[PDB]
Amino acid sequence: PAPFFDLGELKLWSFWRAAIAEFIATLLFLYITVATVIGHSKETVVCGSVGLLGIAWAFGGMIFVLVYCTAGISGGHINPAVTFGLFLARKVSLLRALVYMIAQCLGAICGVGLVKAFMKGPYNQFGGGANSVALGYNKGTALGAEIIGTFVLVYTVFSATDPKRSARDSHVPILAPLPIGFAVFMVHLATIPITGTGINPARSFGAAVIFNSNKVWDDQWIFWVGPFIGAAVAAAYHQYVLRAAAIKALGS
Amino acid sequence: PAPFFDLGELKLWSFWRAAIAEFIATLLFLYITVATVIGHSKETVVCGSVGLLGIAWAFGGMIFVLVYCTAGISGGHINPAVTFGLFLARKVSLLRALVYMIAQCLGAICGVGLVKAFMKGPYNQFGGGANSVALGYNKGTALGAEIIGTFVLVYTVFSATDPKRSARDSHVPILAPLPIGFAVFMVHLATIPITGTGINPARSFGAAVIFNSNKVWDDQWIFWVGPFIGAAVAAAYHQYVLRAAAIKALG
Amino acid sequence: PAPFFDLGELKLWSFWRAAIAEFIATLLFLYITVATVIGHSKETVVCGSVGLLGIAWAFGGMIFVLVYCTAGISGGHINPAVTFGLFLARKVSLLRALVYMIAQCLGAICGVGLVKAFMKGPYNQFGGGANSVALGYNKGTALGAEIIGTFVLVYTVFSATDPKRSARDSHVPILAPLPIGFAVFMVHLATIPITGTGINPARSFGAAVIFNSNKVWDDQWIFWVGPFIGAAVAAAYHQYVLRAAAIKA
Amino acid sequence: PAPFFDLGELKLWSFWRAAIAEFIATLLFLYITVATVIGHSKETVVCGSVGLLGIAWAFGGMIFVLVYCTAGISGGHINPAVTFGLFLARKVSLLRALVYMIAQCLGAICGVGLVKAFMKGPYNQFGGGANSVALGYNKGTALGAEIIGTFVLVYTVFSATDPKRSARDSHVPILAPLPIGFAVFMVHLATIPITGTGINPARSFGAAVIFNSNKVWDDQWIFWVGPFIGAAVAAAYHQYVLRAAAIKALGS
Ligand SMILES: CCCCCCCCO[C@@H]1O[C@H](CO)[C@@H](O)[C@H](O)[C@H]1O
Ligand SMILES: CCCCCCCCO[C@@H]1O[C@H](CO)[C@@H](O)[C@H](O)[C@H]1O
Ligand SMILES: CCCCCCCCO[C@@H]1O[C@H](CO)[C@@H](O)[C@H](O)[C@H]1O
Ligand SMILES: CCCCCCCCO[C@@H]1O[C@H](CO)[C@@H](O)[C@H](O)[C@H]1O
Ligand SMILES: CCCCCCCCO[C@@H]1O[C@H](CO)[C@@H](O)[C@H](O)[C@H]1O
Ligand SMILES: CCCCCCCCO[C@@H]1O[C@H](CO)[C@@H](O)[C@H](O)[C@H]1O
Ligand SMILES: [Hg+2]
Ligand SMILES: [Hg+2]
Ligand SMILES: [Hg+2]
Ligand SMILES: [Hg+2]
Ligand SMILES: [Hg+2]
Ligand SMILES: [Hg+2]
Ligand SMILES: [Hg+2]
Ligand SMILES: [Hg+2]
Ligand SMILES: [Hg+2]
Ligand SMILES: [Hg+2]
Ligand SMILES: [Hg+2]
Ligand SMILES: [Hg+2]
Ligand SMILES: [Hg+2]
Ligand SMILES: [Hg+2]
Ligand SMILES: [Hg+2]
Ligand SMILES: [Hg+2]
């Protein structure tokens, strides 16, 4: 029976800085990625943007950069679904988890907020970076895609945990950033045409909050439930089926 | 004569988990990559997809990710031709090889099956992620391109083996993931116009089973014979010509 | 209060070689990237160029390559804003900072000059690799984008410092090149549509000097002020808020 | 002062295998990259190929892969200009250099030969992967682009040399492969519009020999002379100006 918090949460100066790092990181994540999306969507020259490929790179490349910078401070989650998966495997206390998830959402809101402020017209005209079910797919397909996508991501996160090194003043495992960055990249390549790719409830929520349309709000549940389920299946797979929690993957 | 199995295969709990890791990995491989292919093919706006470059990245990048995740558990093969090459070099017993190959084929079938379940009309309309000889090329060319493409891959795999570290409870060498993923990305840049790029019999077999068309079944043998030959040539070249089995590469 | 220089700047042989490395690397940075940009802009076959994605790669990949080559010699800055940020965190002395910034600017001018010499017509006709505010955006937006873009870069730079290893005969920290190259790549994907992406006053200045147009000079201050502000905030955030100078990523 | 050969060249089993590794690697380099070029050029559907970006990746990524595989056997040169630069810096003997340059040239010819054998029609119709001076540039510009191009590559090679580890039975330094591959990738982004990008006399020679057109042969001297000069200048810069031969670069 896992306690609500532990002594690492009483190291308040570090715990506060971990929270800030998650907040600022998720802000930057959303700023760079949604600005990339809007910059793409608004372009009038045919084949004169960074393209869907550029967009998939923005999301994957930013998770690489942000986990690189924050792994030693917070554990580098940038993603309620990642925090949720790790909480389920008891690598993160409930109190740390909820503090991280709030930070991530508020940061996502602020980041999309910044994109709207910089490019209000194109932002509103071209869908505000929001996830929703694309034409021709049903909600069940959307949800399945969000589950398997988040699974790929959360399973990569588990395999990328360092069993010996932890974020400052915590037991939160350090994460190897490149493979997690690449997993995000891969999932976007597959999933952009179906939902835009969520796999990150905060990323989806921030976009929904700022864009604020009925259609986007109606689909929003898929981007919470899908990722949380995917994360849960990844935690069970890694912990229970493969028994791989002590394994250190050799990065490349 | 190499024995059928060794004491590592009597470590039943680990060996079962290695098979599962190969099953799940190959399922995820086919799912991400075939969904990317179908997603590209169905897009109605010109230059509005991830393009053939995005497709090549999906195959090379997923191999990087999956070998990264599974090297420590199974050895990270995700590919009967890789398993076969290592079997010929005696790094894998016959029993482990067959179990890995079966696991990989079944995984592939399941991953493509999942793409079809998600997008049935576009899945069948745009060719099902299947390999075949493209218009304008002959069988000999397709076969040669699969041999050499598999050679580049399997030579890289051999170069990437860690001579001191093995998968859990085994002597299956750990593999450096990024050069292998890049090798796959590279071969796809070259071979997509010829065959769609096989270099992986389970990848080609999973798509042939789910798509189930005469043309795809007709060409299927190329995607077994080509990679198996390329793998044997790479094994022979690494082991006998260069004698580089103890060599530890860094990247 | 910081001293103008320290004993490391009296190792003249090394200090001069560090300046040359920053000079040559920034030259190479501008040549490869602006040649890519002009090469893309002049192509006549629609979809026949490396695309805006290729251009974003040229900027990010060159920083990866150049920092890799020079981190052990100069500290691998290639960028007055990176140098400024490090100077503010007192990782570099005022004298080394100025010598680096001057070397960077002159390197950038020489690299852009070389592109022009190789392809004068296309260079002039397609904008000279210069940064300026793109149509439909205002000065505030361009400035904001440059602040936050440079913040991403310089924050990654600080996370990428090695706390135990330094450039030859100095205390300038070695930098891990790939995260920094990737941060440059990422910022381009977002910012190319807004300003072309500056996040580097020497890269912006090199192009302005060689292209020499009214609009480009008029906007030039943004590409000094924006990155210098972004760098200062990244330095304050890393050192004062996160207190992370001892950490190795 | 440098002797023609040293005792490492008397270790014949290893020297032979190093020559073979260079031969086979250069063959693979030319096959993958030229097949990529021809596959791109023949595409009938607009924006339906890997594009110029994909071609640049084929060249840069194959150098990464091949230097990864061969560094521990031959030193991973794959390129007479690289071998030449290292020779000038006395890192490779004259005998080893010439054996390597011949192996590379023979390898390149075979690699391109394989592409033509597989797809003769489109190979011949779309220019055979040959380098030559593009419309609107003069010989001086192409020469200069090749010099600086090869300078970027060879200076990166020198920076990537491991000062303590060498190829099997030799003193030829091991090379860190990813920066060298990325250098190749960067030079292609800039130089494809000017010459196709040579920066490698074997790669240029192999394509000229197999494509075999009068115009291409006319330009071929640029692709020997430009790279050899760039390599020489890179060697002088690294060795004499920066005195960097003992520095170990930490790769990322
Ligand atoms: C393990 C599963 C292997 C399945 C092999 C499928 C082979 C299908 O092969 C095809 O069979 C058809 C008759 O059904 C014929 O139309 C074709 O001649 C033949 O190519
Ligand atoms: C592990 C399972 C291996 C299955 C290999 C599939 C081989 C399919 O091979 C197919 O066989 C057909 C019928 O003989 C031939 O007509 C086709 O030309 C051939 O491609
Ligand atoms: C080497 C130090 C570089 C200093 C950067 C030069 C900043 C250019 O600033 C420019 O000044 C012009 C003339 O005053 C103004 O008209 C322009 O608006 C402004 O962009
Ligand atoms: C190992 C195979 C080497 C082939 C010889 C290439 C030597 C370069 O010689 C070339 O020969 C061509 C033949 O018509 C002439 O047109 C060119 O002018 C000449 O440069
Ligand atoms: C055997 C490999 C080294 C030889 C390098 C081949 C360079 C060919 O060089 C070519 O020679 C022709 C005739 O000699 C000239 O007319 C061309 O201008 C020149 O490009
Ligand atoms: C286009 C993709 C090229 C990226 C390959 C770079 C090799 C990664 O090398 C290292 O891997 C570590 C493990 O995650 C990271 O912490 C480091 O940032 C990275 O430098
Ligand atoms: Hg939240
Ligand atoms: Hg907020
Ligand atoms: Hg905001
Ligand atoms: Hg994974
Ligand atoms: Hg099988
Ligand atoms: Hg199955
Ligand atoms: Hg399934
Ligand atoms: Hg290889
Ligand atoms: Hg300056
Ligand atoms: Hg200059
Ligand atoms: Hg110049
Ligand atoms: Hg960062
Ligand atoms: Hg030669
Ligand atoms: Hg040959
Ligand atoms: Hg041949
Ligand atoms: Hg370099």
Side-chain angles (χ1 to χ4, degrees), chain D residues 58-240:
Chain D
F59 280 98
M62 280 302 288
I63 289 310
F64 165 56
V65 164
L66 293 162
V67 175
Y68 179 82
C69 294
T70 60
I73 314 296
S74 64
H77 298 183
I78 333 310
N79 188 339
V82 170
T83 305
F84 179 62
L86 290 166
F87 162 78
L88 287 180
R90 294 161 134 74
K91 304 279 190 144
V92 161
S93 75
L94 180 58
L95 185 52
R96 186 174 297 260
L98 290 166
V99 167
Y100 277 23
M101 302 179 204
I102 294 156
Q104 288 147 3
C105 281
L106 293 174
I109 291 157
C110 261
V112 191
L114 211 39
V115 182
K116 184 181 188 170
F118 287 176
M119 65 198 80
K120 191 190 200 208
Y123 172 90
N124 290 330
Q125 176 178 187
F126 301 104
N131 297 113
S132 69
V133 183
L135 205 50
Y137 305 88
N138 54 44
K139 287 167 209 307
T141 301
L143 187 67
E146 290 286 318
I147 291 165
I148 294 147
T150 310
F151 180 88
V152 170
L153 164 57
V154 173
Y155 164 50
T156 305
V157 166
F158 277 108
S159 307
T161 53
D162 189 308
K164 339 105 206 315
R165 296 184 280 265
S166 295
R168 177 171 66 190
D169 292 344
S170 87
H171 289 119
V172 180
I174 273 155
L175 304 179
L178 181 72
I180 298 168
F182 254 79
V184 173
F185 174 43
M186 298 299 98
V187 177
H188 288 255
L189 299 176
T191 313
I192 283 162
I194 314 168
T195 60
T197 312
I199 73 171
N200 186 327
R203 172 266 178 282
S204 295
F205 193 61
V209 163
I210 296 302
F211 179 56
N212 197 14
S213 101
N214 191 288
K215 210 272 187 209
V216 169
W217 278 123
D218 225 62
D219 285 337
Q220 176 73 190
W221 72 270
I222 289 153
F223 306 107
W224 281 91
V225 166
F228 275 22
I229 292 166
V233 180
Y237 179 61
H238 184 253
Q239 229 72 180
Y240 290 136

Side-chain angles (χ1 to χ4, degrees), chain A residues 23 27 103 105-111 210:
Chain A
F23 167 84
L27 188 157
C105 289
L106 294 174
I109 291 158
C110 265
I210 304 293

Side-chain angles (χ1 to χ4, degrees), chain D residues 3-27:
Chain D
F4 177 60
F5 69 94
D6 58 54
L7 291 168
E9 283 72 79
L10 297 192
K11 273 146 171 152
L12 299 175
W13 180 97
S14 288
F15 186 21
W16 179 236
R17 284 157 174 70
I20 289 171
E22 289 290 324
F23 174 79
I24 294 288
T26 313
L27 184 164

Side-chain angles (χ1 to χ4, degrees), chain C residues 133-212:
Chain C
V133 180
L135 196 56
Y137 303 88
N138 65 47
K139 283 148 58 181
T141 287
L143 184 70
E146 287 290 325
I147 290 167
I148 203 257
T150 311
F151 179 90
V152 171
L153 170 56
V154 179
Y155 171 44
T156 304
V157 168
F158 275 105
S159 305
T161 52
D162 190 318
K164 300 160 232 304
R165 286 186 287 270
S166 279
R168 164 171 73 186
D169 294 338
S170 87
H171 286 124
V172 182
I174 271 167
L175 307 174
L178 182 72
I180 293 163
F182 252 80
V184 172
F185 177 41
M186 290 305 95
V187 175
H188 286 259
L189 296 172
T191 319
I192 280 169
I194 307 168
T195 61
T197 321
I199 72 173
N200 184 329
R203 172 267 178 280
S204 306
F205 184 71
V209 169
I210 299 287
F211 189 59
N212 190 22

